[model samples]
Target: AKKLSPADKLKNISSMLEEIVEDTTVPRNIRAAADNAKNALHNEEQELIVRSATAIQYLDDISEDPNMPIHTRTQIWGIVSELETIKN
Candidate 1:
């Protein structure tokens, strides 16, 4: 399949986050953070989807390295965690 545009990806992420938030098994703090992150993306003045895509790209690059340091790996995971909170 063709790659989705950043806007579309963000929309998908937002929908998925909503679904996760609705799940009672998900942690309350994580859900709250996800909601706040969703709001940030929704209210962004700049192109949030594009920005998020860029961040994802950077994170992917770091994660793809077999020799990536533990600290760097942790940072990449953090990025993924934050990204998961956004719409896309």
Candidate 2:
């Protein structure tokens, strides 16, 4: 099994959100919510990608920093999880 990169996951989520937004049967308010959620997710994804890339670059610099804290990392992971749920 192949693991998907964050960029690929973001693209899949965005596409699913767009499909929901384009569905004529869905209520206007629902569609509007979907649009807003999609935008928010898109922004988060961009930030995540940027931060991840930065982390990659600085890997040797701070990969062993114990003070980095797990809570903040969990928060970012949570955002990714929530973004994955927008379609459902």
Candidate 3:
């Protein structure tokens, strides 16, 4: 299979996470974490692998919150799945 660039993967993941941050019904706490996740993923202070893992951990941790909506949980799961693909 042809390879897609890691930057492209990051772009797609970032956009999806942005949607989570923009959705008002997703709960304030989750939205805040979504913003943090976005920052973590894009933060240049660390390796991409570390950034992705940090973001995934943040999303996974928040997904268990009782205030999380079903749709939001599914959306976050999708994002996390995509994040995992960034690993070589």
lDDT of 1 at 27: 50
Model 1 clash pairs? 10-88, 13-87, 13-88, 14-87
Using lDDT as the yardstick, the better of models 2 and 3 is: 3
Q: Can you give the lDDT of residue 59 in candidate 3?
A: 92
* Candidate 1 global Cα RMSD: 9.2
Best-fitting candidate, scored by lDDT: 3
Residue-wise C-alpha lDDT for candidate 1, range 1-88, written one tens digit per residue: 8867667766765665565456556456544544554555565665775556554554454455555445434544664675755563
Better of 2 and 3 by TM-score: 3
lDDT of each: 0.56, 0.49, 0.89
In candidate 2, what are the lDDT values of residues 1-88, reduced to their tens digit? 9877666766765565566568666555545544555565555545754543432333223324454335433433443454534331
lDDT of 3 by residue, 1-88 (tens): 8777889888888899999999987789999999999999889998889999999999988977988888888889899998887775
Q: Which stretches of candidate 3 lie over 4 Å from their true place?
A: none
Candidates 1 and 2 compared: the better one by lDDT is 1
Clashing pairs in 3: none
In the order shown, the candidates' Cα RMSDs to the true structure are: 9.2, 13.7, 1.4
Model 1 regions more than 4 Å off? 49-88
Pairs of residues clashing in candidate 2: none
